[PDB]
Design a protein around this ligand. Structure first.
Ligand code: DGD
Ligand code: DGD
Ligand code: CLA
Ligand code: CLA
Ligand code: CLA
Ligand code: CLA
Ligand code: CLA
Ligand code: CLA
Ligand code: BCR
Ligand code: BCR
Ligand code: OEX
Ligand code: CL
Ligand code: FE2
Lengths: 136, 50, 333, 450, 59, 145, 75, 34, 34, 31, 37
């Protein structure tokens, strides 16, 4: 089995529209995610706050929905709590807190799009370990 | 315990009594070695002269 | 003739049944107190809390233990790396509750073995022989120091040292595997190679020497009786043994300068044990062995397990179970 | 070739450098060339790290080992441990490279064309391994050089731009140490204190004032000792306990340097003052304290009454009491209660961890620092997988503290072994039975039976 | 210019390092060819000073 | 099959090649060794972080006027803790906000005053601490420019 | 004849510069052409799973192992 | 005895160093590199 | 328990001084050959 | 020429070179 | 990253740090050249 066209299609928006990630995008993401996100979100789990995981099920229950590329990209632009009552940009990496966190001082849009695509795509490949944890 | 401490003397008694043992040794050692100033052997680890 | 002189002389005498020497002045009292405390504690030491969670563990014979399960439990985790002599406790009972005897015994044992090395060298000097046996003995001393002192220093607590017992030793080894992956560390591999090679070379050298023994005894008398203490000629034929060894494997491949052979015999296990003690010391500061977890990936991206992943599975099984009540947070730092 | 063959010398090719024991000029050439090698490595590695530098990541994540030292000296570093520019590091690297070229040429010249023995032509640089006055003179000269170097460090920290201080008000930054502590009692309290937990023999220096004062004292002591050894001659008591030969001096140096290597290895693993966590990453205990702190904060946000929740063992899972009574973080990290970090001190009162400060006056930057330190603990593998041994390999990080400590501990022990070997051989050779027994004067046969 | 200037410096340093070790060894070779080596040493230090002057000025 | 010679005799790969040090087209990998780019997209140097810095300075003031009250009582740990817990962001904020030479020089003066306050508080000398706090107040309320 | 004499012989290297590289290139082409996958039955990186089965293809019977493997290794 | 022993020794050392180096480069780019 | 500390501090300095002054008493001269 | 040695040596060396060539090709065969 | 002037000369720096190790070996190759006299 390959990383074919069927398995590279992910939700792009709330509606449900589904775009396709080019293989280059996949690579760049896996790189960017491992370089910046990996230290705390290795394996699709949140190391500091294990309750708020990164698996698609938890993203589906966040407020608002975080199970599509657009909402993940917006979350990077402007992060909120699990219920979305207030912003936690001062305690989470974000473009809004670019001054606080120097890592994002260079990230571009495509970079964010590729990172979100990787986050969306990895549970389609592994399908049980993205956010699973030790057990799996 | 973790109170830093010069050496570990906490009570003047402890220092004043760790004293006589070392001084006793110094005296017994001086008993053999006394009035020595010269006698330079000038050889590789000889120290033959007593 | 002074008194000091007379003493110094008796001390460095080479006609005493056991050589005392100046290093003996440190070796004898220290080892004697260590062994006295160890013998008493192995019989009548009360339970000790090792994880500092008020869950004492019994390790004494009089507390329902046998020789294998019994041990001298290391000091409490609450103490950590702090010095805990007898006089710092408010009572002897409390000193026993927090595992002070472990600290006493281990510190004295380390000083004693260092002084033992020194005494070996000192007697070598007195007898006019070449002074490098204590260099060979350094390897077990280094291993003992790494397992008893360096690892607690790196981890930050004396509760992480090896308990003085059989089942305690096995527990220490298993937890070390779980938290550090000792097997996949090249220095442990070097140590296993050194020990296996030491056994191999010992057995082969003994077989080759005993096989080629000059016929100087009957059949109804121990072959060992042919040799007489203080001989002037070799009781064995080097030529026959070398011929057999060369015909067995290869002609080029063979040692002739028996001196080179014995030097190699000394060199192999010693360097193996040195490298192993360095593995333990390096891993005391969290430089673990190779982690080949999920290294093989198919085209799609799914992970294909190797033999290393089953090792990781066993390590997880050991890890989630060791010190069940001690942990409160997800990471073991 | 007279001096370079197992016949003329008696030393095999593998132990070939021992042929230079009695050759003065060639030994000097070897020493100088080796120093040139050291300088070359320093410059080359600095240039390598500057090349592979990435401004996004902190230095302790890039696997760097030398930029941290020059940053601690106060070169191209801003408040909070941010790196501004990497030009001074490049300058240091190139200067070291050029100096290494010069030193290497000098070593080669003295080893190849220089006179074999310096005693005949230059009766000022020639020695004998056996006279004590010249040995002490050389020792005193180099001791004065070392004292001048310690002075130079003090001068750099006091009047040449200052040094980086983590405990500085408002965060870590470069400052001038105006008032170093000169009290002999406080300075030598480090030297004469216990090496066990809670004491930290020389590793437990806290503020920069103590560092500067200790360096002033070391420089003064070294200058005085260097002057004193130059003028005087070894006394009677030291003249009959020491073996006076080149290999004996080498063995003494080996023992001393093994002790120094052990000290530096354990010093890089525990110290926050001369090894700021913003550059070397958090220490062993620091990561554990950071984990406990961040989970305490997270559970406090939910509304749980911290310092009132009994742990699974009934001991308290957030706040405990130290065996001395101080209030500390609970869990397995109670072994690390001796920790003192710049981001946790604001919360500490005279009684320990203040509770009113924790409940009310918490800061977001402390949360970020604790999360970053927990996410970057000194854990790793030989292939630098990072994290716990059971973790999958996605991150790529091993803390420089682990590298430094492990490497220098290994080197220190092997230099202790070198001390053992060389001390034994030097004493045997001085006595005169380093080659065999005798076979006609065997001392065992002249001693009483037993 | 700097980039080039240094390039040269690297080339001349390579030419010097490949030939100095061979000289010293080969008995006698040294003395006879001392003045050319001195001239090349002066060229080397001049190149270093020129590179330093470039940078400085250019900053 | 599917070879992968050091990015010179094959191709990229959804994951296998590493020699690359390029082969991405996205744009400039800052350096041949950095996945990230240069500072020319998204975050801007001075968007609206200056407002946050000014707020940090105002609250730094508010923190620093309660030091004389803490030194009037013989409490020294509180002085150090107050001077380090929230002033932590203030060093970087003041350094970044300063752009002219006068601001730089007198921010240096303010840092000197704060360091003197810290040292005197450690040495437990009330007069020196009070004078240093007064000088720090003067510099800081003369900084708002 | 001792090893070193043979190793230093020129007529040895004139028969060890047309034999060794050819053998090395043949070993390279053994898997460059993908023959080794078919000879030993090991799966290629894209043959571990198929569209029909998404789990590990284990053998459960003994005397019908041939057919079972033939089926599993269908696609 | 035409070719000196240490020359062929050096050539063999270069070959083996090359092969072993190609192995680590691989531990890094391709199968098994994750 | 201060008495116990005193007695141990004596024993320790006792034996340590014995060691230090035993090795200072012209030990290299003590040897088979002279 | 074909002494037992030549034989044993070649029977051990030919597969070794074959396998080394094969293993090198693999180091490139990248997923 | 190196200053823009020396980014061209970067590849030499990429190999410079590992030089010393080779010096060591040179000793061994030099000894081999003289027949491990
Ligand atoms: C036998 C009896 C002798 C025991 C001697 C060895 C004890 C070494 C030891 O306990 O070492 C620990 C101490 C480190 O001290 C630590 O020092 C730390 C200092 O940190 C403090 O200070 C830091 C500075 O800011 C930070 O503030 C930190 O937060 C703060 O806690 C803490 O105090 C720790 O509690 C304390 O343990 O090492 C030291 O001081 C340096 C030790 C010298 C090196 C010793 C070599 C180790 C022996 C290896 C032997 C190898 C075998 C050879 C024989 C064969
Ligand atoms: C039987 C066979 C074995 C017998 C032994 C005798 C034959 C020698 C065989 C050598 C085998 C290895 C060959 C060398 C391969 C190598 O090294 O491998 C190459 C790697 C370099 O590879 C790079 O290594 C990096 C390591 O990560 C580093 O870089 C990363 C990038 O950010 C992170 O920063 C991370 O934190 C940091 O550690 C990453 O893995 C890169 O992806 C990878 O390209 O080693 C490097 O660093 C190269 C330089 C290493 C020198 C450092 C040695 C000193 C280290 C102290 C150790 C003291 C001993 C402690 C006890 C052990
Ligand atoms: C840092 C390591 C080091 C150093 C400085 C030395 C130094 C020395 N060794 Mg030596 N040695 C070493 C490691 C080292 N060794 C090792 C590891 C071994 C074990 C294999 C030996 C084994 C050994 C033996 C067996 C002998 C020496 C001898 C000597 C001395 C004379 C060497 C000689 O005549 O060279 C002759 C060699 C050459 C002329 C060829 C080398 C060409 C040059 C020097 C190489 C470097 C060039 C450099 C890269 C160019 C830089 C130029 C600069 C301007 C930039 C000399 C003092 C000899 C001795 O005792 O002297 C009395 C001797 O017999 N050594
Ligand atoms: C400053 C430190 C220092 C100095 C100046 C010396 C000096 C000397 N030592 Mg020595 N030694 C030292 C430290 C030192 N030692 C240490 C720390 C140890 C403990 C391991 C020893 C153990 C030792 C022994 C056992 C012997 C000496 C001997 C000697 C003499 C001849 C050595 C020689 O020709 O080297 C020759 C050098 C070599 C052959 C190089 C060997 C390379 C080693 C084995 C591997 C190095 C691995 C390296 C870390 C990384 C490898 C990289 C690789 C993977 C590419 C000479 C006086 C000999 C003697 O008695 O002479 C009188 C002797 O027999 N030394
Ligand atoms: C520790 C370092 C060191 C030491 C002790 C020496 C010591 C010495 N060098 Mg020297 N040298 C060194 C480093 C060192 N060098 C370096 C790094 C280089 C390269 C720049 C040289 C280049 C060098 C040359 C070119 C010459 C010496 C010479 C000499 C000798 C006479 C020096 C003199 O008259 O000084 C007098 C100073 C005060 C009284 C003397 C033994 C000379 C020699 O022995 O040859 C005749 C000589 O011609 N050296
Ligand atoms: C690298 C540092 C170093 C080294 C190797 C030595 C080496 C030595 N010192 Mg020492 N010394 C030093 C630094 C050093 N010193 C400094 C910095 C001072 C100043 C405090 C002194 C003050 C000093 C005194 C007062 C004496 C020695 C003595 C000695 C000798 C015996 C050492 C002993 O038994 O203990 C020996 C040559 C003794 C000696 O033999 O006097 C000549 C002696 O009485 N030293
Ligand atoms: C493979 C060999 C090797 C390598 C690469 C290193 C590498 C290193 N060692 Mg080292 N070491 C080694 C072997 C090695 N070691 C061995 C065998 C031992 C003995 C067991 C040691 C013992 C040792 C100790 C004890 C220490 C190191 C340390 C270090 C690190 C810093 C070195 C340094 O700055 O010293 C510099 C040394 C000098 C002599 C330079 C003097 C410069 C002073 C001048 C003043 C500068 C001034 C402030 C600025 C001037 C500015 C101007 C305007 C005036 C570095 C990573 C240090 C470290 O970081 O510990 C973790 C440390 O403390 N090493
Ligand atoms: C032609 C005129 C000239 C000029 C304008 C400079 C200017 C400079 N030199 Mg320089 N220099 C010159 C000639 C010159 N040099 C000559 C003829 C030599 C002898 C060959 C040197 C040798 C020299 C050394 C050895 C060093 C300098 C350094 C410096 C810089 C230190 C000031 C600084 O940090 O500013 C701020 C500058 C920057 C932040 C970037 C540069 C400065 C840019 C130092 C340096 O570059 O350190 C960074 C340094 O270490 N110079
Ligand atoms: C005796 C002997 C020996 C030894 C030797 C020695 C030890 C030597 C050394 C040497 C050395 C130690 C050398 C060095 C050199 C250096 C150099 C030569 C440098 C150069 C530099 C440069 C060229 C630079 C450049 C640059 C710049 C300027 C900028 C940036 C870029 C670059 C970096 C490029 C041996 C063992 C071999 C053998 C036996 C004998
Ligand atoms: C810098 C600094 C510091 C320091 C300072 C000081 C001041 C130091 C010093 C140091 C010292 C002050 C040291 C000393 C040491 C000593 C020793 C180490 C000794 C030894 C001895 C010996 C080894 C002997 C031997 C012997 C014997 C025993 C017997 C007889 C014989 C003989 C003689 C051989 C501090 C930490 C504060 C802080 C930071 C900075
Ligand atoms: O004590 Mn013994 O084992 Ca070293 O990790 Mn943490 O602590 Mn406990 O857990 Mn895992
Ligand atoms: Cl915990
Ligand atoms: Fe034997």
């Amino acid at each position: 089995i390959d990383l074919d066209e069927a398995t590279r299609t992910v939700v792009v928006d709330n509606a449900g529209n589904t775009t396709v990630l080019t293989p280059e995008q996949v690579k760049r993401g896996k790189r960017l995610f491992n370089a910046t996100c990996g230290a705390c979100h290795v394996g699709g789990i949140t190391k500091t706050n294990p309750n708020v995981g990164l698996d698609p099920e938890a993203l589906s229950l966040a407020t608002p929905r975080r199970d599509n590329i657009n909402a993940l990209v917006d979350y990077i632009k402007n992060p909120t709590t699990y219920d979305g009552l207030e912003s936690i940009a001062e305690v989470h990496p974000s473009i809004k807190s670019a001054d606080i966190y120097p890592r994002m001082r260079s990230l571009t849009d495509e970079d964010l799009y590729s990172i979100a695509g990787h986050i969306m795509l990895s549970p389609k490949i592994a399908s049980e370990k993205w956010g699973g944890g030790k057990i799996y | 315990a973790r109170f830093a401490n010069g050496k570990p003397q906490s009570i003047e008694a402890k220092y004043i009594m760790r004293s006589p043992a070392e001084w006793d040794r110094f005296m017994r050692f001086m008993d053999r070695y006394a009035e020595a100033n010269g006698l330079g052997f000038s050889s590789x680890x000889x120290x033959x002269x007593x | 003739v002074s008194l000091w002189e007379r003493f110094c002389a008796w001390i460095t005498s080479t006609e005493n049944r056991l050589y005392i020497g100046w290093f003996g002045c440190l070796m004898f009292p220290t080892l004697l107190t260590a062994t006295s405390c160890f013998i008493i504690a192995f019989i009548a030491a009360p339970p000790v809390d090792i994880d500092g969670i008020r869950e004492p563990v019994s390790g004494s014979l009089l507390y329902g233990n046998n020789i294998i399960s019994g041990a001298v439990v290391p000091s409490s985790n609450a103490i950590g790396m702090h010095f805990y002599p007898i006089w710092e406790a408010a009572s002897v009972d409390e000193w026993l509750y927090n595992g002070g005897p472990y600290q006493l015994i281990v510190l004295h044992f380390l000083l004693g073995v260092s002084a033992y090395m020194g005494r070996e060298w000192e007697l070598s000097y007195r007898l006019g022989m070449r002074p490098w046996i204590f260099v060979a003995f350094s390897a077990p001393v280094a291993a003992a120091s790494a397992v008893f002192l360096v690892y607690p220093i790196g981890q930050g607590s004396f509760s992480d040292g090896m308990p003085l017992g059989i089942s305690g030793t096995f527990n220490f080894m298993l937890v070390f595997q779980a938290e550090h992956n000792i097997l996949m560390h090249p220095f442990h591999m070097a140590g296993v190679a050194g020990v296996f090679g030491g056994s191999l070379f010992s057995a082969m050298h003994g077989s080759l020497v005993t096989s080629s023994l000059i016929r100087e005894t009957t059949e109804n008398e121990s072959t060992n009786y042919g040799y007489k203490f203080g001989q002037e000629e070799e009781t064995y034929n080097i030529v026959a043994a070398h011929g057999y060894f060369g015909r067995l494997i290869f002609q080029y491949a063979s040692f002739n300068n028996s001196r080179a052979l014995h030097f190699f015999l000394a060199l192999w296990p010693v360097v193996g044990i040195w490298i192993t003690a360095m593995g333990i010391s390096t891993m005391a500061f969290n430089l673990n062995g190779f982690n080949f977890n999920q290294s093989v990936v198919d085209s799609q991206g799914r992970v294909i397990n190797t033999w290393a992943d089953i090792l990781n599975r066993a390590n997880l099984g050991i890890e989630v179970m060791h010190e069940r009540n001690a942990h409160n947070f997800p990471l073991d730092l | 070739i007279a001096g370079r063959d197992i016949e003329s010398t008696g030393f095999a090719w593998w132990s070939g450098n021992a042929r230079l024991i009695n050759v003065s000029g060639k030994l000097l050439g070897a020493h100088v060339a080796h120093a040139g090698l050291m300088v070359f490595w320093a410059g080359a590695m600095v240039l390598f790290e500057v090349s592979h530098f990435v401004p996004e990541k902190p230095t302790y994540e890039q696997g760097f080992i030398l930029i941290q030292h020059l940053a601690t000296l106060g070169y191209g570093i801003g408040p909070g441990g941010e790196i501004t520019s990497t030009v001074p590091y490049f300058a240091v690297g190139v200067i070291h490279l050029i100096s290494s070229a010069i030193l290497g040429f000098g070593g080669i010249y003295h080893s190849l064309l220089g006179p074999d023995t310096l005693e005949e032509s230059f009766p000022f640089f020639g020695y004998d391994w056996r006279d004590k006055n010249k040995m002490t003179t050389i020792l005193g000269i180099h001791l004065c050089l070392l004292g001048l170097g310690s002075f130079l460090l003090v001068i750099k920290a006091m009047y040449l731009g200052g040094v980086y201080d983590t405990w500085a008000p408002g965060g870590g930054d470069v400052r001038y140490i105006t008032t170093p502590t000169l009290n002999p009692i406080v300075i030598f309290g480090y030297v004469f204190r216990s090496p066990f937990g809670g004491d930290g023999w020389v590793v437990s220096v806290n503020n920069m004032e103590d560092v500067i004062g200790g360096h002033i004292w070391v420089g003064i002591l070294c200058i005085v000792g260097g002057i004193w050894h130059i003028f005087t001659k070894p006394f009677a008591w030291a003249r009959r306990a020491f073996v006076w030969s080149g290999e004996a001096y080498l063995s003494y140096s080996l023992a001393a340097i093994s002790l120094m290597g052990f000290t530096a290895a354990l010093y890089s693993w525990y110290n926050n003052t001369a090894y700021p966590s913003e550059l070397y990453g958090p220490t062993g205990p620091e990561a554990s304290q950071a984990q406990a702190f961040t989970f305490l904060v997270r559970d406090q946000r939910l509304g749980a009454n911290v310092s009132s929740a009994q742990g699974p063992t009934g001991l308290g899972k957030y706040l405990m009491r130290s065996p001395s009574g101080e209030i500390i973080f609970g869990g397995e990290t109670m072994r690390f209660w001796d920790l003192r970090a710049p981001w946790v001190e604001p919360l500490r009162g005279p009684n320990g961890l203040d509770i009113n400060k924790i409940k009310n006056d918490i800061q977001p930057w402390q949360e970020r620092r604790a999360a970053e330190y927990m996410t970057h603990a000194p854990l790793g593998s030989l292939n630098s997988v990072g994290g716990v041994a059971t973790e999958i390999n996605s991150v790529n990080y091993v803390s420089p503290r682990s590298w430094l400590c492990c490497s220098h501990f290994f080197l220190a022990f092997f230099f202790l072994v070198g001390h053992w070997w060389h001390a034994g051989r030097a004493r045997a050779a001085a006595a005169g039975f380093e080659k065999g027994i005798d076979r006609d004067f065997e001392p065992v046969l002249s001693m009483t039976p037993l | 210019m700097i980039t080039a200037l240094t390039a040269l410096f690297v080339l001349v340093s390579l030419a010097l390092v490949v030939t100095v070790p061979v000289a010293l060894a080969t008995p006698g070779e040294w003395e006879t060819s001392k003045d050319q080596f001195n001239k090349i040493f002066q060229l080397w230090v001049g190149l270093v000073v020129a590179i330093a002057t470039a940078d400085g000025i250019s900053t | 099959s599917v070879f992968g010679l050091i990015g010179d005799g094959t191709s990229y790969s959804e994951g296998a090649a590493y020699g690359t040090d390029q082969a991405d087209k996205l744009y400039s990998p800052y350096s041949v060794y950095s996945p990230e780019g240069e500072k020319s997209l998204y975050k801007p140097d001075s968007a609206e972080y200056l407002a946050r810095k000014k707020a940090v300075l105002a609250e730094t003031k508010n923190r620093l006027q309660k030091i004389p009250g803490y030194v009037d009582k013989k409490e020294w740990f509180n002085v150090k803790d107050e001077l380090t817990r929230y002033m932590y962001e203030t060093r970087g904020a003041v350094r970044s906000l300063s752009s002219s030479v006068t601001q730089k020089e007198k921010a240096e003066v303010f840092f000197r005053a704060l360091e003197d306050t810290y040292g005197a508080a450690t040495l437990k000398k009330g007069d020196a601490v009070k004078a240093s706090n007064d000088k720090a107040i003067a510099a800081l309320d003369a900084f708002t420019a | 004849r001792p090893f070193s004499d043979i190793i230093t012989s020129v007529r040895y290297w004139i028969i060890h510069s047309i034999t060794i590289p050819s053998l090395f290139v043949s070993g390279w082409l053994f898997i460059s052409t993908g023959l080794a996958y078919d000879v030993f039955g090991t799966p290629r990186p894209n043959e571990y799973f198929t569209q029909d089965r998404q789990q590990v293809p284990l053998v459960n019977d003994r005397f019908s192992a041939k057919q079972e493997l033939e089926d599993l290794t269908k696609g | 005895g035409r070719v000196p022993l240490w020359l062929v020794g050096l050539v063999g050392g270069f070959a083996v160093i090359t092969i072993v180096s190609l192995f680590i480069y691989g531990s890094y780019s391709g199968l098994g590199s994750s | 328990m201060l008495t116990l500390k005193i007695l141990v501090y004596t024993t320790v300095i006792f034996f340590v001084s014995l060691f230090i002054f035993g090795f200072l008493s012209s030990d290299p001269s003590r040897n088979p050959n002279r | 020429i074909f002494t037992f040695r030549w034989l044993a040596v070649h029977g051990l060396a030919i597969p070794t070179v074959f396998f080394l060539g094969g293993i090198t090709a693999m180091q490139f065969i990248q997923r | 990253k190196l200053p823009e002037a020396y980014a061209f000369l970067n590849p030499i720096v990429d190999v410079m740090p590992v030089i010393p190790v080779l010096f060591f070996l040179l000793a061994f190759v030099w000894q081999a050249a003289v027949s491990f006299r």
